[PDB]
Amino acid sequence: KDLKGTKTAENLKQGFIGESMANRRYLYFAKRADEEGYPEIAGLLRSIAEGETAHAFGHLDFIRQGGLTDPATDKPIGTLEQMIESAIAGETYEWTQMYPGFAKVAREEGFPEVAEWFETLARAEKSHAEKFQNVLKQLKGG
Amino acid sequence: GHMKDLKGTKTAENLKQGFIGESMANRRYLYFAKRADEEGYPEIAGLLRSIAEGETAHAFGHLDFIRQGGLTDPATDKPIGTLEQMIESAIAGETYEWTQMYPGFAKVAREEGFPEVAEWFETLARAEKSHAEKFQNVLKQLKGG
Numbered sequence: 001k002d003l004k005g006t007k008t009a010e011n012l013k014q015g016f017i018g019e020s021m022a023n024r025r026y027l028y029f030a031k032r033a034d035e036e037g038y039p040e041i042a043g044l045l046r047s048i049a050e051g052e053t054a055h056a057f058g059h060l061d062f063i064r065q066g067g068l069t070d071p072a073t074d075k076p077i078g079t080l081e082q083m084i085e086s087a088i089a090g091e092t093y094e095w096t097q098m099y100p101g102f103a104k105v106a107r108e109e110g111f112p113e114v115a116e117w118f119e120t121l122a123r124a125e126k127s128h129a130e131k132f133q134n135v136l137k138q139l140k141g142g
Numbered sequence: 143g144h145m146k147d148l149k150g151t152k153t154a155e156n157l158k159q160g161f162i163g164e165s166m167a168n169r170r171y172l173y174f175a176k177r178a179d180e181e182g183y184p185e186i187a188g189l190l191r192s193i194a195e196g197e198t199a200h201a202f203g204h205l206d207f208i209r210q211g212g213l214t215d216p217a218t219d220k221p222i223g224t225l226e227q228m229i230e231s232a233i234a235g236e237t238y239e240w241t242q243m244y245p246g247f248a249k250v251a252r253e254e255g256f257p258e259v260a261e262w263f264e265t266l267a268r269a270e271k272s273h274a275e276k277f278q279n280v281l282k283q284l285k286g287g
């Protein structure tokens with residue numbers, strides 16, 4: 001059956017978001033176990049994080065096979081070119097809108113160090129966008 | 143200045159949203175890299191994997207500001223200051239997933255006529271239950287000394 005417009009389409013999206021966060025969280029936690037001398041705990045966090053990678057990738061497989069869009073950008077991700085276009089769209093949103101906006105709010109609320117971080121990130125995502133744009137030119141132009 | 147209280151601020155909400163987006167970016171770019179791999183684009187795949195390391199650094203930095211600002215884990219709304227608290231956050235999210243989120247997703251998938259997706263969600267419910275048990279075993283290690 002067609003997944004478009006179903007609740008299952010939404011649940012694959014929110015499964016993807018949670019899986020993505022779980023992998024990042026567990027690898028961040030592992031580095032604390034590392035410094036404190038808990039190699040078995042760190043190893044378990046790393047191995048379970050591989051599980052969450054598998055989960056996230058499986059959600060994306062169903063999304064792509066179903067003709068659903070990228071959770072992050074609402075752009076198709078069927079072909080490699082589409083995947084690069086999805087990357088460009090996300091990076092563009094981040095540098096032109098999201099991170100500058102976060103920076104302005106941080107400065108206005110009295111958090112200059114957080115604002116500086118968001119402005120670093122905006123410059124980083126702009127750099128990423130440019131790099132991906134150069135890939136798209138290669139792919140689209142053969 | 144790193145320990146300024148962020149509770150209640152719009153900046154707290156923005157750090158959480160930034161962490162979500164960074165998390166997804168790393169997963170997406172490593173997924174895309176595998177498509178570039180099979181098709182024979184190693185420079186594209188390598189760029190995707192290197193940019194993914196950037197998004198790891200971003201995500202981890204967001205987590206640093208979240209913890210230092212006295213904020214909670216974006217995924218679980220639990221404190222993640224100490225290692226013990228980090229494992230308790232892992233257990234809380236695993237518990238939500240196996241007791242509620244994935245079983246509910248599987249029921250809706252079956253109702254909507256997606257039995258293959260339902261089977262996948264059921265597999266994941268069992269997986270997150272196994273993860274919860276293994277983290278519970280570790281926590282008992284930490285608290286026992």
Ligand SMILES: [Cl-]
Nearest residue numbers: 038039040041
């Ligand atoms: Cl250990």
Ligand SMILES: [Cl-]
Nearest residue numbers: 183184185186
């Ligand atoms: Cl290449």
Ligand code: NI
Nearest residue numbers: 019051052055
């Ligand atoms: Ni998972």
Ligand code: NI
Nearest residue numbers: 091124125128
């Ligand atoms: Ni980026």
Ligand code: NI
Nearest residue numbers: 143144145146
């Ligand atoms: Ni300070």
Ligand code: NI
Nearest residue numbers: 164196197200
């Ligand atoms: Ni980023």
Ligand code: NI
Nearest residue numbers: 236269270273
């Ligand atoms: Ni899990």
